[PDB]
């Protein structure tokens, strides 16, 4: 008889203890294709991005301060890398008679790009 | 988890700038890993360069310097 | 302790923005883009000149070996529309 | 009696030569004494891992001498040497034998 | 195989479960008929 | 007329590894061009590093920051380790 | 009554057989003389009477077959991408639209 | 000479693609490929006649070819 424990608590009562107009799907999407293509501002909210860099650089060297311009350089570079990769993916999709990027479409692009 | 900070709508915004009209739902979490491994390449070299200057702080100059090594130069931040 | 001199071609990029457009202006960010541009393309063309020389087992960067590399890098029309201006400029220099 | 710098460093690649080259290469104005020693040390290593892997490849094809092919296998089989020699195209290498799963018969 | 649930199939609450072998449902030791001793 | 190349040196290290295995001449040239290319990449990166740090000399340090910036992944660690023990034996033997 | 029928390998068996044959060969495929000429007319356009070594040609080939076998390889992955075993001109094109030569 | 691109025969373009692991070569590929061979061989050979002239040599050397391939990124080992 297989058994498993899920309460994960040796005792109960742990708390009591001492310790309308609507557009068709895609029209708004193309409108803000135009919006984010005519625009130049930076699309990954900064703070969250900076943090991504702190928790990931931590591995290579502790106590590594980053000049502000640097995390802005990492953002720009990351958004440029991903917009280039996403142009390629859309192509890797429009190739297969489709209009929806899918994970496979990007595991391939990166193989032809040779980034893998 | 700081990785989950790269939110869906943000990945959607990157796709929109990239001209994608319908994003699969499984893309969002693929784009994180790809993002991480890439940043994890630049920032690695960014720091090799940093610990060569015996500097403890990193600079944007070292960042564009690591990009030059990888291959993807970045104009607008020095050098 | 005045800050040391940072090399930049900014002053120059403006003279050239003032000929092509006597009334336009640039923004710090675009100027710095242009400085990174000229430094990058100069490093590219100067590195090519170097090898060209080393390959031919000679040791002197001259005008020939740079007309050659700018050609090998700058692509297409850009190349021809450069090498011509470059030889003019060299002859006008040597002129006097 | 003059000894060589390689026997001082315990290496087979030439440390002397890799100094001259470093100097005439004008990689930089001044080159120190230990820089050619370290470079010869790294070059022999990379020349060795690649030669070992080539030796593992050859005996397999039961051939006494290494031929350019054995050097592609070694490089493409390994996932490190392949990032290094990754935009490099060796002479007479062929390609790693591989066919996709969908191309197999059912 | 399949992992049994992590919520009792009788009371929809967490705890120590007796896992069905040929069925992906899990039951509390006291929730069955007759209730099963945990020893 | 004299052609400088790493013929006998790579042959030696080959017997050090396998003292029973032959080598093809074309394959040799593969080895010679390969060690020349990786030498160029490690030395160039070093030159750069230096020129960035406003230094002027190629210390064994640069060649390292370099080997760890060019050689990928583990190939590096084992390169460093061997380079550090090689320069350690160079300074021990003076 | 019983009429003969020649032994013909089914479409694809001969294919995969020569695939295994050719992925073990290192020998060059495009024939030499035909290739050599490919250049003398691809060079005459850049400089007249440029002689060529019998090694420049061999090199400019090894480098070509190598370039082409790489592109075909990404072409195939691109052909499998649309769930098809036939490669198409679009594939060589998607592939090259991603390496950044296009 | 002229139009010797046809020398890279279909039997061969295939053998290459066969080498590359493809099983069904659609027609309309044999023409596309030859076009790709003639943009690659162009650039390389161009960067080789430029190297050739710089050295004021006439004999396009294999040495130049290798240096040319490097510029474009496709380095070749086996010749120098
Ligand atoms: Zn059940
Ligand atoms: Zn229950």
Could you explain how this protein is built, in words?
Chain A has helices at residues 27-38, 46-57, 68-94, 103-113; strands at residues 3-5, 65-66. With 116 residues, chain A is mostly helical. Chain A has one domain: Histone, subunit A, CATH 1.10.20. In chain A, helix 2 (46-57) packs across helix 3 (68-94) and helix 3 (68-94) packs across helix 4 (103-113). The radius of gyration of chain A is 23 Å and the shape is extended. Chain A starts with a strand and ends with a helix. The relative contact order of chain A is 0.07. Chain B has helices spanning 8-17, 28-50, 60-70; one strand at residues 57-58. With 79 residues, chain B is an all-alpha fold. Chain B has 3 helices and 1 strand. Chain C has 96 residues and is mainly alpha-helical. In chain C, 68% of the residues lie in helices and 0% in strands. Chain C has helices at 10-17, 28-55, 64-73, 77-95. In chain C, helix 3 packs antiparallel against helix 4 (77-95). The termini of chain C are far apart. In chain E, strands 1-2 form a two-stranded antiparallel sheet. Chain E has strands at 16-19, 26-28. Chain E is 0% helix and 18% strand. Chain E starts with 15 loop residues before the first strand and ends in an 11-residue tail after the last strand. At the D-F interface, helix 1, helix 2, strand 1, helix 3 and helix 4 of D face helix 1, helix 2, strand 1, helix 3 and helix 4 of F. Strand 1 of chain D pairs parallel with strand 1 of chain F.
Summarize the structure.
This is part of a larger assembly, with 2 copies of chain A, 2 copies of chain B, 2 copies of chain C, 1 copy of chain D (106 residues) and 1 copy of chain E (39 residues). Chain A is mostly helical and 116 residues long.
**How many strand units of chain D?**
2
Q: Can you identify the CATH superfamily of chain D?
A: Histone, subunit A
The best one-word shape of chain D is: elongated
Profile the largest sheet of chain C. none
- CATH domain fold name of chain D: Histone, subunit A
CATH names the topology of chain C as Histone, subunit A
CATH homologous superfamily descriptor of chain C: Histone, subunit A
What is the CATH architecture term of chain C?
Orthogonal Bundle
What percent of residues of chain C are in strands?
under 5%
How large is the radius of gyration of chain D?
Answer: 19 Å
String of helices and strands of chain C = HHHH
Q: What would you report as the Rg of chain C, rounded to the nearest angstrom?
A: 16 Å
Subcellular location (chain D): Chromosome; Nucleus
Protein name (chain D): Histone H2A
Domain Histone H2A C-terminal (chain D): 79-106
Family (chain D): Belongs to the histone H2A family.
Describe the secondary structure blueprint for this structure.
The structure is cut from a larger assembly and holds 2 copies of chain A, 2 copies of chain B, 2 copies of chain C, 1 copy of chain D (106 residues) and 1 copy of chain E (39 residues).
Chain A: E1 3-5, H1 27-38, H2 46-57, E2 65-66, H3 68-94, H4 103-113
Helix pairs in contact in A: 2-3, 3-4
Chain B: H1 8-17, H2 28-50, E1 57-58, H3 60-70
Helix pairs in contact in B: 2-3
Chain D: H1 5-9, H2 17-24, E1 30-31, H3 34-60, H4 68-77, H5 81-84, E2 88-90
Helix pairs in contact in D: 2-3, 3-4
